[PDB]
Amino acid sequence: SEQSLASTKTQKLFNNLISKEESLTKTWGAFGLYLSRQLRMGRGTNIPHFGTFTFSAPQFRVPVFLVSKEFVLGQPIKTGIFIDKHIRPYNVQTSGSISVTKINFTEIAQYADQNKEAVKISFERIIRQLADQTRQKRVVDMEIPGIGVFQVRNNIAAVHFDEYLIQNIKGVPKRPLSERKQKGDMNPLEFGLKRLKFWIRQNCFNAQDAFLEMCNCALGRTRAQRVKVDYKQFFEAINKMELDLNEEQIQELFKQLDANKDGYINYTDWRNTIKDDNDHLQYIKDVIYKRQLHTDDVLKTMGLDREHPPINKYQLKDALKKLDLTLTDIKAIRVAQTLLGHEEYISMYDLARSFETIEEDDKIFDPSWFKDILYKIKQKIMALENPNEIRESFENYDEHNEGILDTANFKTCLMRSQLKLTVKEINRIVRYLPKVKVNNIDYYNFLKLVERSDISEFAVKLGKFIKDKKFTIPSFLKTVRRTLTQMSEFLHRNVFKGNDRLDIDFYVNELDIDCDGYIKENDVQSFLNRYTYFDQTQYTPLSMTRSLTLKSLDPRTVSMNTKTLYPFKALSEAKVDTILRDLRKKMELKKMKAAELFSTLDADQDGFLTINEFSENIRKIIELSQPAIDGFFAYMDKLHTGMVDLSSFLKVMREDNFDWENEMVFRIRQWFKKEGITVEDSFRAIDQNFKREINVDDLEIFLKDCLKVKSEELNKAKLDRLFKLIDQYKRGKVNFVDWKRFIMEDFGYGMNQTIMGGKKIDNISSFDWKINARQQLGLVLTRRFSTLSHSFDVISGYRKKLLFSHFKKWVQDTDALRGFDLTESLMQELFSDLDSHNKGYLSESDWEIAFGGFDWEHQMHEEIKEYVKQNFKSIEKAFEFFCQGNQNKIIEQADFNKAINSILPKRFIDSDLKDLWVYVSSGQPQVDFHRFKIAFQNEDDVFEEKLLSKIRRLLRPTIKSVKKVLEQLDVNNIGYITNLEFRNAIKTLNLGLAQNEVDLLLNICEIDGRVNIKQFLKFIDFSESDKKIVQRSILKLREITNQVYTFLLSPKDAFRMFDVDSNGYLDFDQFSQFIGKLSQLSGHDMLPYSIIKDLFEYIDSKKDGVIDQAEWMDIFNKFHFNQILGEWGKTKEFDKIIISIGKNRRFLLDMFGSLQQRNIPITFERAKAIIGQMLRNSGQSLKEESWPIILKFAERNGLIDYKFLLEVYKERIKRIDS
């Protein structure tokens, strides 16, 4: 144990610490070797202050270590012994005359290669340290090298010796000395100034005119040149000058104007304060001010936006000429020069600041009010109860689903929404939305902008990366090549530098549609064209054979299923009707028929419709948004197979499933739960003809009888479908392996490698009929063609694309789907399943990926070796059986062929057998064992339930009636019997029950100290399933017993004869020769192996591996006149009568010769009367019905030839005696 080693290292560490180890280690090892030697010697080892090692008292003797009373002073330590993981005390004070020697320190010294005194000192250190522990530890365990662990617990001590040592020393104390010896050898102012200037420019007054003007306003019409204005006159003027200035602005303006600070504004101060700036720049500024133009409107009028890069003088004058239509180029250049100053470029912020435009208030997210309103609309949208209400209203107002609405309708939808948008905000938004078709707006673009790292971004970036540098898809593939890993590395190094290579793999695994590990042109095409639908995995209809959603798990080689692109969401019926009405009226205007549209939509003329082709084609008639087209496409494809054919598109223009079969699979699995019978028994429960094969007849019988399925619901088609679902190996007949794997296999562990020939796909049931049909397809292809390329070419008819017509024609004239009976829709979905990229056609690579993993020769091989492994205990018994008893232990072609034909009838033809020989022998004319090995490598309630089941099994062959015995021990017919007579009755039944379980039955049936009978009989019986099993075996057994009677006379005599070893028990080999002899004599065929083993298990009711005389009788006792004949056969009276007949042979010789000499024929009556008289003379009486067995066989032509009977009886005795 680890604790013992830890304690030993603890002792060593303490010793090392005290010293501050090798000596002590070597000393302990040497002492252990010495103890091992002496224990092998059989001599006791007495060591002072330890105790003595000795063997136990007898008989064999177990080593026992006695602890000395001086091992620990003051604390009594008792002598104990270890047994059964436990340590028990020992109370033997005598050594049983076992000579005991003292410890030899010189021997231990020479073993340890150290000084004898040193070894003694170390060993004494060991004893003292052990004693100190035992004083301080209640529990002590210490190991001895080559002996075991010295264990202490609760003041009880013993040593856990080595088990191998114990077996070795067993029997030593009785052998001579030499053998022991051999065994033991181990060799404000600014604003006011602006307002005053604004007026001065407004009324076109210069300094003179403006001065005279406000002088007139403040002081009336005056003509004096020298006019001075004080603060009060200036204020009343401001009131009369409507400058909209408050008192503070007025005071600041007056203070600034009064340059001399004399309290009066003379004309000198006003020339000093304001200068004539008659420039068009101030004109434009005044225009912006009076019209109250916002900044962004002015910018867009000039042709520039907030994000426009800095502009030079040329773009500046162009924008200015855009702003003012009347301005000339020279004036615009002057204005641009003034604006720029000494800078080559003017920033747009500088331009806006200089223009003194109006900035919008309450900006939160972006200086542009357009993005501000977009963000506010967004926040309200996810603040809605339904964020999708706006798009629903937009679609409702779009009667044609064009995605396009005029200004009026888009306006109306804007007002009618809850967005709480003002009319001014609403009409401001529209003016900057792009206008398609003059007066129409695409609201999907608006929704995308308002809404505005994943698979979509990765696909878009990859597409742009491909497009920018002008590479076609094969050119891109070749450039990358200059597999998944290379693609990932190239993407990480050339495109997505900012993403981790792990994320690059995370995207490339989605780039691999076909999941073969290789990215071809089709993968890139599908990924670029239909990437948008990678997030509709929540809408696939879960056929519960396939469960849950599973992602790209970054497979090593173990791949997964496909949850990928499709437009699965569908429009509702009313809107589909509206769209159909519109499209049909446009077609009627076009005068273009339905089937004409159907052919026209099919661009590639393949007979089907795909989402890419439809989306690119239907838009050429009616403008439809992506959601509308996708939904109507989903509505058409009720099969959801990725294609829409002529018929379904007619029907939309104008099913069936497999839930029942898998549901029955679950129900059958549940019904197995209650039974408790084994897999072999439940397999026997179906095959009622012992045919080992559950054909359609056997399956339907089991279905309608047990499962109580209505006969109206069972037709050939679905029964064949269920049978094909069961049949793993597609053999048209279900053996033991087939049904066993049907019942046992788990759904979610990917055991379907055995089906798909090594290819693994997880979370897909092996029992899905799609995969079974694929397996049948692959096996037929491998059987009827050489190379998959050749098969692809011939099926495709030397074409590059395989259409649905070619495939259905080939399966029809090939009968490859016989037994599945798939309908047209089912064939369409199968062809869809074969198409991984949903292109509507299969390429050569598709064919190879779909069927490359199947090999009928290989499949043949693993099926054969699986059968061999399961049905033979070892490879040796197998090889011996296939040797057919050959004395050279080498299997020639004929022997192996015969073995294969017998073991698996009708599986193979001569060519298959020759191929088997070629495969197994590797071209050698003979096969040996090495080649064969290589080629073929309350709890009580359940306890009583088990015991009752065992007793029901054991009472099957007992001919004695339990009721009869129970009544015979019930004298008064009261119905209660006490324990003693119940025990005697159970013994009389001779059920071989051990005392513990008969006491268990006593506990079961104990009521007030008595056992009750009627309810006991009610409790133990035969179940319906057991009765059905029992009824099955008579007919085979009845004819076997018929042959035994006719040829082997009686079963008892045949049992005696074939018990060659004379142990009273038969193995399976003697039984094999039993059927061999019976078939040879009877002229019937050799019964093959599995029927033989099943009959052997039926006869062997004890499961002990052998058949005794009792079971041999009881099984054969089951087949009134014949019943009593079988009864008397098992009796001691039968053999006693034979012996009494045979002991007097000479008497019958003389008597029969005397009758013959008197010309008296020996008929039946005379012989029977004489034998009865002889039996009466010996005190034996015989029943009249039991005469024939004694006499019928020896009769020839109606006469009894005595010599034949006498000789066979003599042989009978000669066999019986031994």
Short mmCIF file of C-alpha atoms in Angstrom, two decimals, residues 374-726:
data_model
loop_
_atom_site.label_atom_id
_atom_site.label_comp_id
_atom_site.label_asym_id
_atom_site.label_seq_id
_atom_site.Cartn_x
_atom_site.Cartn_y
_atom_site.Cartn_z
CA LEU A 374 -30.76 56.73 -37.60
CA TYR A 375 -29.51 55.88 -34.10
CA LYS A 376 -32.68 57.21 -32.44
CA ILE A 377 -34.87 55.20 -34.82
CA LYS A 378 -32.74 52.14 -34.02
CA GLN A 379 -33.09 52.60 -30.26
CA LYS A 380 -36.84 52.99 -30.59
CA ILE A 381 -36.98 49.89 -32.83
CA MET A 382 -35.52 47.62 -30.22
CA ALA A 383 -37.54 49.58 -27.66
CA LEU A 384 -40.67 48.39 -29.50
CA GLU A 385 -42.74 45.45 -28.33
CA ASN A 386 -42.10 44.08 -31.82
CA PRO A 387 -38.96 45.52 -33.49
CA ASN A 388 -40.15 43.95 -36.77
CA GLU A 389 -43.41 45.92 -36.95
CA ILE A 390 -41.93 48.58 -39.25
CA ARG A 391 -40.75 46.09 -41.86
CA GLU A 392 -44.11 44.32 -41.66
CA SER A 393 -45.89 47.60 -42.39
CA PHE A 394 -43.49 48.31 -45.26
CA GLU A 395 -44.16 44.88 -46.76
CA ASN A 396 -47.92 45.33 -46.30
CA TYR A 397 -47.85 48.64 -48.17
CA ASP A 398 -45.75 47.01 -50.93
CA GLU A 399 -48.46 45.14 -52.82
CA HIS A 400 -45.96 43.66 -55.31
CA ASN A 401 -43.24 42.99 -52.69
CA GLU A 402 -40.82 44.94 -54.88
CA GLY A 403 -39.15 46.45 -51.82
CA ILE A 404 -39.70 49.84 -53.46
CA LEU A 405 -42.09 52.59 -52.36
CA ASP A 406 -42.66 56.16 -53.49
CA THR A 407 -42.25 59.25 -51.33
CA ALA A 408 -45.97 59.36 -50.49
CA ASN A 409 -46.36 55.78 -49.25
CA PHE A 410 -43.04 55.80 -47.39
CA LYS A 411 -44.19 59.06 -45.80
CA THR A 412 -47.50 57.45 -44.79
CA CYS A 413 -45.75 54.44 -43.24
CA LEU A 414 -43.48 56.88 -41.38
CA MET A 415 -46.40 58.80 -39.87
CA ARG A 416 -48.49 55.72 -39.04
CA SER A 417 -45.66 54.11 -37.05
CA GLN A 418 -45.05 54.50 -33.32
CA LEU A 419 -41.58 55.99 -33.99
CA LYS A 420 -42.80 59.36 -32.63
CA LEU A 421 -41.24 61.13 -35.61
CA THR A 422 -42.16 64.73 -36.41
CA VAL A 423 -43.17 65.75 -39.92
CA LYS A 424 -40.05 67.92 -40.22
CA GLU A 425 -37.79 65.05 -39.16
CA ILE A 426 -39.65 62.69 -41.50
CA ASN A 427 -39.32 64.84 -44.62
CA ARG A 428 -35.73 65.76 -43.74
CA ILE A 429 -34.83 62.05 -43.62
CA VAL A 430 -36.33 61.28 -47.03
CA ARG A 431 -34.53 64.06 -48.90
CA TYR A 432 -31.16 62.42 -48.16
CA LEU A 433 -32.27 58.85 -48.86
CA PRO A 434 -31.15 57.62 -52.31
CA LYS A 435 -33.83 57.82 -55.00
CA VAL A 436 -34.18 54.78 -57.26
CA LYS A 437 -36.51 55.08 -60.26
CA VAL A 438 -36.81 58.86 -59.79
CA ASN A 439 -39.51 58.83 -57.10
CA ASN A 440 -39.03 55.55 -55.23
CA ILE A 441 -37.08 54.39 -52.17
CA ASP A 442 -35.79 50.92 -51.23
CA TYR A 443 -36.86 50.50 -47.61
CA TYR A 444 -34.71 47.39 -47.11
CA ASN A 445 -31.67 49.62 -47.59
CA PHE A 446 -33.06 51.96 -44.92
CA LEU A 447 -33.63 49.02 -42.56
CA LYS A 448 -30.08 47.79 -43.14
CA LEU A 449 -28.63 51.25 -42.46
CA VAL A 450 -30.69 51.60 -39.28
CA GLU A 451 -29.57 48.15 -38.16
CA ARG A 452 -25.98 49.10 -38.99
CA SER A 453 -16.62 38.65 -36.86
CA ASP A 454 -19.11 36.09 -38.18
CA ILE A 455 -19.52 33.67 -41.08
CA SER A 456 -21.28 36.32 -43.18
CA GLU A 457 -18.44 38.81 -42.78
CA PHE A 458 -15.89 36.10 -43.57
CA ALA A 459 -17.73 35.13 -46.76
CA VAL A 460 -18.17 38.76 -47.87
CA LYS A 461 -14.50 39.53 -47.21
CA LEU A 462 -13.39 36.40 -49.08
CA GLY A 463 -15.58 37.34 -52.05
CA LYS A 464 -14.22 40.88 -52.13
CA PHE A 465 -10.66 39.56 -51.81
CA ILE A 466 -11.25 37.28 -54.80
CA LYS A 467 -12.96 40.01 -56.84
CA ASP A 468 -10.45 42.82 -56.29
CA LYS A 469 -7.46 41.05 -57.86
CA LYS A 470 -9.41 39.47 -60.76
CA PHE A 471 -9.02 35.76 -59.98
CA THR A 472 -11.46 33.09 -61.08
CA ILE A 473 -12.22 30.28 -58.64
CA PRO A 474 -9.85 27.68 -60.18
CA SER A 475 -7.23 30.41 -60.54
CA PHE A 476 -7.72 31.28 -56.87
CA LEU A 477 -7.33 27.61 -55.94
CA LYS A 478 -4.12 27.30 -57.95
CA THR A 479 -2.76 30.53 -56.46
CA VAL A 480 -3.45 29.28 -52.94
CA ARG A 481 -1.81 25.95 -53.78
CA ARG A 482 1.30 27.89 -54.79
CA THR A 483 -6.36 21.05 -48.57
CA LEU A 484 -7.95 22.62 -45.50
CA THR A 485 -4.63 23.39 -43.79
CA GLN A 486 -3.10 25.19 -46.77
CA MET A 487 -6.29 27.20 -47.27
CA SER A 488 -6.28 28.19 -43.59
CA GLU A 489 -2.62 29.21 -43.61
CA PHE A 490 -3.03 31.24 -46.80
CA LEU A 491 -6.12 33.00 -45.41
CA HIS A 492 -4.32 33.76 -42.14
CA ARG A 493 -1.22 35.11 -43.90
CA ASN A 494 -2.79 36.97 -46.85
CA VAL A 495 -6.30 38.13 -45.89
CA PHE A 496 -7.21 37.88 -42.21
CA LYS A 497 -3.99 38.95 -40.51
CA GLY A 498 -5.96 40.35 -37.57
CA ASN A 499 -7.66 37.03 -36.81
CA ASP A 500 -6.13 34.06 -35.03
CA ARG A 501 -5.38 30.95 -37.05
CA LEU A 502 -7.87 29.16 -34.79
CA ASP A 503 -10.58 31.49 -36.08
CA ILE A 504 -9.27 30.93 -39.62
CA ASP A 505 -9.89 27.21 -39.13
CA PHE A 506 -13.23 28.08 -37.52
CA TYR A 507 -14.21 29.73 -40.82
CA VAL A 508 -12.51 27.29 -43.22
CA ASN A 509 -14.37 24.35 -41.68
CA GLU A 510 -17.54 26.16 -42.74
CA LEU A 511 -15.90 26.77 -46.12
CA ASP A 512 -15.70 22.96 -46.49
CA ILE A 513 -19.24 22.07 -47.58
CA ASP A 514 -18.44 18.54 -48.76
CA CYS A 515 -16.45 17.83 -45.55
CA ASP A 516 -13.95 15.57 -47.35
CA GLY A 517 -10.97 17.65 -46.22
CA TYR A 518 -10.52 19.09 -49.74
CA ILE A 519 -11.84 22.41 -51.03
CA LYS A 520 -12.72 22.25 -54.73
CA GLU A 521 -14.41 24.67 -57.13
CA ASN A 522 -17.91 23.52 -56.14
CA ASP A 523 -17.25 24.29 -52.47
CA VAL A 524 -16.14 27.84 -53.27
CA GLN A 525 -19.06 28.36 -55.65
CA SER A 526 -21.68 27.22 -53.14
CA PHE A 527 -20.04 29.15 -50.30
CA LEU A 528 -19.99 32.38 -52.31
CA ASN A 529 -23.49 32.03 -53.76
CA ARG A 530 -25.59 30.73 -50.86
CA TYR A 531 -23.82 31.79 -47.65
CA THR A 532 -26.77 33.83 -46.36
CA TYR A 533 -28.73 30.83 -45.03
CA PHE A 534 -26.13 29.38 -42.64
CA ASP A 535 -28.14 30.53 -39.59
CA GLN A 536 -31.47 28.73 -40.16
CA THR A 537 -30.46 25.56 -38.28
CA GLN A 538 -33.38 26.04 -35.85
CA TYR A 539 -35.95 25.33 -38.59
CA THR A 540 -34.88 21.96 -40.02
CA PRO A 541 -37.58 19.32 -39.37
CA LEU A 542 -35.96 17.00 -36.84
CA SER A 543 -36.51 13.46 -38.07
CA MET A 544 -35.90 12.02 -34.62
CA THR A 545 -33.52 9.49 -36.12
CA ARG A 546 -31.32 12.59 -36.30
CA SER A 547 -31.37 14.51 -33.01
CA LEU A 548 -30.29 18.01 -31.96
CA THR A 549 -28.00 20.40 -33.86
CA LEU A 550 -24.27 19.68 -34.09
CA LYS A 551 -21.60 22.05 -35.35
CA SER A 552 -18.23 21.75 -37.05
CA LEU A 553 -16.51 20.08 -34.09
CA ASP A 554 -13.10 20.58 -35.73
CA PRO A 555 -12.98 16.87 -36.64
CA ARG A 556 -9.74 14.93 -36.66
CA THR A 557 -11.11 12.38 -39.12
CA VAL A 558 -14.44 11.66 -37.44
CA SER A 559 -16.75 13.85 -39.51
CA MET A 560 -20.26 15.12 -38.77
CA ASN A 561 -23.60 15.74 -40.48
CA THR A 562 -24.61 18.80 -42.51
CA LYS A 563 -26.68 21.69 -41.18
CA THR A 564 -26.29 24.21 -43.96
CA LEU A 565 -27.87 26.64 -46.41
CA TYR A 566 -31.51 26.54 -47.48
CA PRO A 567 -34.45 29.00 -47.66
CA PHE A 568 -36.65 27.02 -45.28
CA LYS A 569 -38.95 29.76 -43.96
CA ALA A 570 -42.13 30.01 -46.04
CA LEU A 571 -44.75 32.69 -46.66
CA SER A 572 -48.32 32.29 -45.44
CA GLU A 573 -51.11 31.11 -47.72
CA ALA A 574 -52.87 34.46 -48.25
CA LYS A 575 -49.78 36.40 -49.34
CA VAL A 576 -48.76 33.48 -51.56
CA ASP A 577 -52.21 33.71 -53.14
CA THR A 578 -51.77 37.45 -53.71
CA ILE A 579 -48.33 36.95 -55.28
CA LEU A 580 -49.61 34.10 -57.45
CA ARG A 581 -52.54 36.24 -58.62
CA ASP A 582 -50.21 39.09 -59.57
CA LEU A 583 -47.72 36.82 -61.36
CA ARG A 584 -50.52 35.02 -63.20
CA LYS A 585 -52.08 38.27 -64.44
CA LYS A 586 -48.67 39.40 -65.71
CA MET A 587 -48.25 36.00 -67.42
CA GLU A 588 -51.71 36.35 -68.99
CA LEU A 589 -50.62 39.73 -70.33
CA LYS A 590 -47.49 37.94 -71.60
CA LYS A 591 -49.68 35.11 -73.02
CA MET A 592 -47.06 32.64 -71.78
CA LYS A 593 -48.29 29.28 -70.52
CA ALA A 594 -47.67 27.52 -67.22
CA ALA A 595 -45.43 24.76 -68.59
CA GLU A 596 -43.70 27.43 -70.67
CA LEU A 597 -42.78 29.26 -67.46
CA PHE A 598 -41.76 25.93 -65.95
CA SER A 599 -39.28 25.21 -68.75
CA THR A 600 -38.10 28.84 -68.93
CA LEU A 601 -37.27 29.02 -65.22
CA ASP A 602 -35.02 25.97 -65.60
CA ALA A 603 -31.92 27.76 -66.90
CA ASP A 604 -29.76 24.61 -67.06
CA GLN A 605 -32.66 22.43 -68.32
CA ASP A 606 -32.09 19.90 -65.53
CA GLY A 607 -35.79 19.50 -64.70
CA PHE A 608 -35.61 21.28 -61.33
CA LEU A 609 -35.60 24.70 -59.70
CA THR A 610 -32.90 25.97 -57.33
CA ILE A 611 -32.92 29.06 -55.13
CA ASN A 612 -30.05 30.69 -57.04
CA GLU A 613 -31.60 30.01 -60.45
CA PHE A 614 -35.13 30.95 -59.35
CA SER A 615 -33.96 34.12 -57.59
CA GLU A 616 -31.95 35.16 -60.64
CA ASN A 617 -34.79 34.29 -63.03
CA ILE A 618 -38.18 35.12 -61.46
CA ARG A 619 -36.96 38.70 -60.93
CA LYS A 620 -37.02 39.02 -64.73
CA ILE A 621 -40.85 38.98 -64.57
CA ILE A 622 -41.92 40.30 -61.14
CA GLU A 623 -39.67 42.27 -58.79
CA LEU A 624 -39.58 40.40 -55.47
CA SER A 625 -37.55 40.88 -52.31
CA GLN A 626 -35.22 38.19 -50.99
CA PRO A 627 -37.52 37.17 -48.07
CA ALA A 628 -40.54 36.87 -50.38
CA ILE A 629 -38.71 34.76 -52.96
CA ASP A 630 -37.15 32.58 -50.26
CA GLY A 631 -40.46 32.02 -48.50
CA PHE A 632 -42.38 31.20 -51.67
CA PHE A 633 -39.56 28.83 -52.65
CA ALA A 634 -39.92 27.10 -49.29
CA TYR A 635 -43.68 26.92 -49.79
CA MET A 636 -43.19 25.20 -53.14
CA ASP A 637 -40.70 22.65 -51.78
CA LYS A 638 -42.97 20.81 -49.37
CA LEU A 639 -40.44 17.98 -49.66
CA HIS A 640 -37.75 20.51 -48.61
CA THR A 641 -35.21 18.61 -50.72
CA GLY A 642 -33.59 21.65 -52.35
CA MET A 643 -35.22 21.13 -55.75
CA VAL A 644 -38.66 21.83 -57.19
CA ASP A 645 -39.69 19.54 -60.04
CA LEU A 646 -42.31 19.89 -62.76
CA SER A 647 -45.05 18.11 -60.80
CA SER A 648 -44.76 19.92 -57.46
CA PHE A 649 -44.50 23.27 -59.24
CA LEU A 650 -47.66 22.37 -61.16
CA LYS A 651 -49.35 21.51 -57.87
CA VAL A 652 -48.32 24.79 -56.24
CA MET A 653 -49.38 26.54 -59.46
CA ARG A 654 -52.64 24.54 -59.45
CA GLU A 655 -47.31 12.64 -48.12
CA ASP A 656 -45.37 9.84 -46.43
CA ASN A 657 -42.87 9.46 -43.61
CA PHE A 658 -41.09 6.82 -41.52
CA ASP A 659 -41.97 7.83 -37.96
CA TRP A 660 -44.08 4.70 -37.50
CA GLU A 661 -41.22 2.23 -38.09
CA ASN A 662 -38.76 3.90 -35.72
CA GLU A 663 -41.58 4.35 -33.21
CA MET A 664 -42.13 0.59 -33.39
CA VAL A 665 -38.38 0.19 -32.84
CA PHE A 666 -38.64 2.19 -29.61
CA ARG A 667 -41.77 0.28 -28.57
CA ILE A 668 -40.06 -3.08 -29.16
CA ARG A 669 -37.03 -1.90 -27.18
CA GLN A 670 -39.36 -0.91 -24.33
CA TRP A 671 -41.20 -4.24 -24.52
CA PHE A 672 -37.87 -6.05 -24.09
CA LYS A 673 -37.38 -4.24 -20.77
CA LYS A 674 -40.12 -6.05 -18.86
CA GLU A 675 -39.29 -9.58 -20.04
CA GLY A 676 -35.86 -10.29 -18.56
CA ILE A 677 -35.02 -12.99 -21.13
CA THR A 678 -31.63 -12.91 -22.85
CA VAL A 679 -30.93 -11.71 -26.38
CA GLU A 680 -30.64 -15.31 -27.57
CA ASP A 681 -34.00 -16.21 -26.03
CA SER A 682 -35.67 -13.15 -27.53
CA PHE A 683 -34.19 -14.04 -30.93
CA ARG A 684 -35.58 -17.57 -30.58
CA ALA A 685 -38.91 -15.93 -29.72
CA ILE A 686 -39.30 -14.82 -33.36
CA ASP A 687 -37.74 -17.56 -35.53
CA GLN A 688 -40.38 -20.22 -34.91
CA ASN A 689 -39.16 -22.59 -37.65
CA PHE A 690 -35.58 -22.73 -36.29
CA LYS A 691 -34.53 -21.14 -39.59
CA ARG A 692 -32.11 -18.68 -37.90
CA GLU A 693 -33.51 -16.10 -40.32
CA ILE A 694 -36.42 -13.77 -39.60
CA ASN A 695 -37.93 -13.59 -43.07
CA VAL A 696 -40.92 -11.37 -43.88
CA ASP A 697 -43.24 -14.16 -42.71
CA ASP A 698 -41.49 -14.51 -39.34
CA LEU A 699 -41.42 -10.74 -38.87
CA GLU A 700 -45.11 -10.29 -39.66
CA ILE A 701 -46.03 -13.23 -37.42
CA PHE A 702 -44.13 -11.69 -34.51
CA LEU A 703 -45.57 -8.24 -35.22
CA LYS A 704 -49.24 -9.22 -35.39
CA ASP A 705 -49.09 -11.85 -32.64
CA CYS A 706 -47.13 -10.13 -29.86
CA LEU A 707 -47.22 -6.41 -30.69
CA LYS A 708 -50.92 -6.74 -31.65
CA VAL A 709 -50.49 -4.59 -34.76
CA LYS A 710 -53.66 -4.54 -36.86
CA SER A 711 -53.59 -6.70 -39.98
CA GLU A 712 -55.10 -3.90 -42.08
CA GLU A 713 -52.02 -1.77 -41.32
CA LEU A 714 -49.52 -4.39 -42.57
CA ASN A 715 -48.82 -4.50 -46.31
CA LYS A 716 -45.85 -5.87 -48.22
CA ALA A 717 -44.38 -2.41 -48.81
CA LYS A 718 -43.88 -1.22 -45.24
CA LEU A 719 -43.03 -4.69 -43.91
CA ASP A 720 -40.32 -4.84 -46.58
CA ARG A 721 -39.21 -1.36 -45.51
CA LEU A 722 -38.92 -2.48 -41.89
CA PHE A 723 -37.05 -5.62 -42.94
CA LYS A 724 -34.60 -3.56 -44.99
CA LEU A 725 -34.18 -1.25 -41.99
CA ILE A 726 -33.33 -4.26 -39.84
#
